[PDB]
């Protein structure tokens, strides 16, 4: 049966034709009138040194003061960034962890990794200690990302080519999204927590709807695995970082590639990206041992944060946009401002 | 210039730091091995002799060994292999009885070539185990080794064939001076595989200590 194969071929050809006919001018042509942002200099304000292995994930609290970090020594550490103090140190059951999350209300944290199980830890207990609230199982591959919708729901992305939306109370997979063809390595929730995006090793990204659970849009254009993704603060665009030493800015409504951030010097991949509060600076962590910042409109480099002696693995920006946190494969976790 | 609660918080943070340092010191004295095979190669026995990752465990000669078996991690190998950088040794298992067909020996050779010549494992030593020797002897009683390897001009005896297989598997190494591999034929005797693993681990530990100070 090749008739339906030809149907798919003609449908994708029509999709390409519609996308091409909807393009009239690039974002660079519009933004060339914007004055250059100028050189951006950032200095290390705080340095948090508690870990003893490679750091694989970190997440900022909602209050822009507390953060949580995960490394390979089987420890989850809660840092008070203002005074570099330690609040909690949670020993993990499985030392292979590749993700971390912080609840918006600040009550729960989440962890996961090569053990195919997402653990949820409760922070505020009458007993005065941190204990594992709930273990979620059902994935057949390693977990690569997990994000909190609220105190009762969670979204997980695994290497079994599928994504899941859970229910912490019952502990069962409320919904499952299956539309990929490779490992899924990233996850970013929209500001209204109604849709989200996922980036896969298939060299593509997809826009999922949480409420009912089917893929609405598929964005392609990369050339290798996608390691990170992040939503624009407006909620109508996102940025993907891949292994071909390039970043890309896609738009939801235009259903098209908007711009590409790449320079001939860089040849190494990208491990994590994030935006700024106003959506003007696009930060990106590379394997070149240093992070870069890009003027998101003109696609010009405007600063390099080089203070790490290994590959930068995690990167985040506070809610008020007053700081940046970078964690590399050396145990140190650095704060820039 | 701090309040009472700030001083108490600082004291709590210091206690947390002390606990972390003690845990790291305790956990820095273990020997971590990574176990790799080719499915039915014979990883069962090496393990039983002593849903994701499956860490086994043992204490031998006052040394704590933790063996990590990936097992059923049916996904991309390059997307999680770098998590295992820094392991003391890689225990590769291969069966001498899988030259019949359905090519299994060639798959094991391809896997060994991929693992040995890797950017992450540029200095981690590999302990090669050749098991299922008795069934290989039974097979070589009648069938020749020419089926898997079309060469010779030598002979069809257990010793020469085993030496040929060992040389072929050692030939796949490319970092001949930054990496050393050890080959052992598994024996039914109790304390022969564990002793060999201990000797290889010691050797790696001596080399690591010499690298630390700088003398080597």
């Amino acid at each position, epitope marked *: 049966l090749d008739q339906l194969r030809q149907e798919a071929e003609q449908l994708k050809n029509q999709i390409r034709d519609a996308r091409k006919a909807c393009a009239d001018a690039t974002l660079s042509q519009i933004t060339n009138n914007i004055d250059p942002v100028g050189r951006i200099q950032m200095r290390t304000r705080r340095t948090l040194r508690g870990h003893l292995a490679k750091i694989y994930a970190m997440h900022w609290g909602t209050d822009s003061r507390l953060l949580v970090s995960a490394s390979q020594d089987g420890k989850l550490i809660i840092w*008070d960034s203002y005074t570099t103090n330690k609040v909690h140190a949670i020993p993990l059951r499985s030392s292979w962890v590749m993700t971390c999350a912080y609840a918006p209300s600040g009550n729960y944290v989440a962890c996961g990794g090569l053990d195919n199980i997402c653990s949820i830890y409760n922070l505020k207990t009458r007993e005065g200690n941190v204990r594992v609230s709930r273990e979620l199982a059902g994935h057949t591959g390693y977990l690569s990302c997990c994000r909190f919708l609220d105190d009762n729901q969670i979204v997980t992305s695994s290497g079994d080519t599928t994504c899941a939306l859970w229910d912490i109370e019952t502990g069962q997979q409320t919904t499952t999204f299956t539309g990929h063809t490779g490992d899924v390595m990233s996850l970013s929730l929209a500001p209204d927590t109604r849709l989200f995006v996922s980036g896969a090793c298939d060299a593509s990204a997809k826009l999922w709807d949480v409420r009912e659970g089917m893929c609405r849009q598929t964005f392609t254009g990369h050339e290798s695995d996608i390691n990170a993704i992040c939503f624009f603060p407006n909620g109508n665009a996102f940025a993907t970082g891949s292994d071909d030493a390039t970043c890309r800015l896609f738009d939801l409504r235009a259903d098209q590639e908007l711009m590409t951030y790449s320079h001939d010097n860089i040849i190494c991949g990208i491990t994590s990206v994030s935006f700024s509060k106003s959506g003007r600076l696009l930060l990106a962590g590379y394997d070149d041992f240093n992070c870069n910042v890009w003027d998101a409109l003109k696609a010009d480099r405007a600063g390099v944060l080089a203070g790490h002696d290994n590959r930068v693995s995690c990167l985040g920006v506070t809610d008020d946009g007053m700081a940046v946190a970078t964690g590399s494969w050396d145990s140190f976790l650095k704060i820039w401002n | 210039t701090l309040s009472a609660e700030d001083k108490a918080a600082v004291e709590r943070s210091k206690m947390i730091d002390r606990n972390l340092r003690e845990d790291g010191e305790k956990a820095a004295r273990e020997v971590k091995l990574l176990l790799l095979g080719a499915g039915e190669s014979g990883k069962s026995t090496i393990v039983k002799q002593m849903t994701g990752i499956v860490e086994t465990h043992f204490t031998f000669k006052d040394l704590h060994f933790k063996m990590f078996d990936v097992g059923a991690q049916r996904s991309e190998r390059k997307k999680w292999i770098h998590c295992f950088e820094g392991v003391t040794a890689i225990i590769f298992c291969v069966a001498l009885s899988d030259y019949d067909l359905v090519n299994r020996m060639h798959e094991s050779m391809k896997l060994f070539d991929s693992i040995c010549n890797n950017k992450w494992f540029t200095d981690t030593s590999i302990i090669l185990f050749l098991n299922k020797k008795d069934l290989f002897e039974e097979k070589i009683k009648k069938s020749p080794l020419t089926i898997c390897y079309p060469e010779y001009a030598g002979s069809n005896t257990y010793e020469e064939a085993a030496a040929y297989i060992q040389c072929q598997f050692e030939d796949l190494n490319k970092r001949k001076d930054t990496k050393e591999i050890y080959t052992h034929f598994t024996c039914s005797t109790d304390t022969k595989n564990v002793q060999f693993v201990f000797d290889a681990v010691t050797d790696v530990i001596i080399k690591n200590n010499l690298k630390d100070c700088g003398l080597f």
Partner: single-chain antibody
Amino acid sequence: DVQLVESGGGLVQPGGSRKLSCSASGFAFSSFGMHWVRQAPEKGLEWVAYISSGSGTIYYADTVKGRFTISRDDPKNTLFLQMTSLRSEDTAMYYCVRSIYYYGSSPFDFWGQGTTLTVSSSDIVMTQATSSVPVTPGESVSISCRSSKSLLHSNGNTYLYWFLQRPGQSPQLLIYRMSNLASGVPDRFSGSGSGTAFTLTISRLEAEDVGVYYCMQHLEYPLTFGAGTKLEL
């Protein structure tokens, strides 16, 4: 159950060496700084001693320095206070409160039961002015407390705590750091004010709410309580 029991009371001749024990069950005793707080048979509360987690910090009051000692046993979850050379002014009821300090914690949250002891025959001063207030159910009441030194520290915290003691019971934390509501406290209770002037407001006052209200400062040791405002009828 986070029960917290004390023992070692009774009648002691002056010059005795009575020792009080306090056993805690139901929580991580190893990571909780523990205080000992006394109360006179008819007067208000008065801080007595404090020991931190890990026994790295110990504080005593001025009236008890050199006579009382405090110690912990973490393996068996016990807190001891040894008293020496008892005088006629040490007859009181003793409580074994707990407090854990970190960013966002609520010290003094759980109070003990109380052990009765009888004997035969530069500090921040905090006043509470009015002692008795006639109230009726369904009304709104305000309690005013006033310190002598401003409690608004440089970082931004205002260390002041509001406690409520019901008749025949032990005090329970109501408000910590002058604005935060303790766990299990209804919405009606609220706190406000500025430096050296604090006010606790109860809206829609109802029964099982009368008793005594105390304001305490945690800016610097020794901790000082107020005279206490009493609600009746």
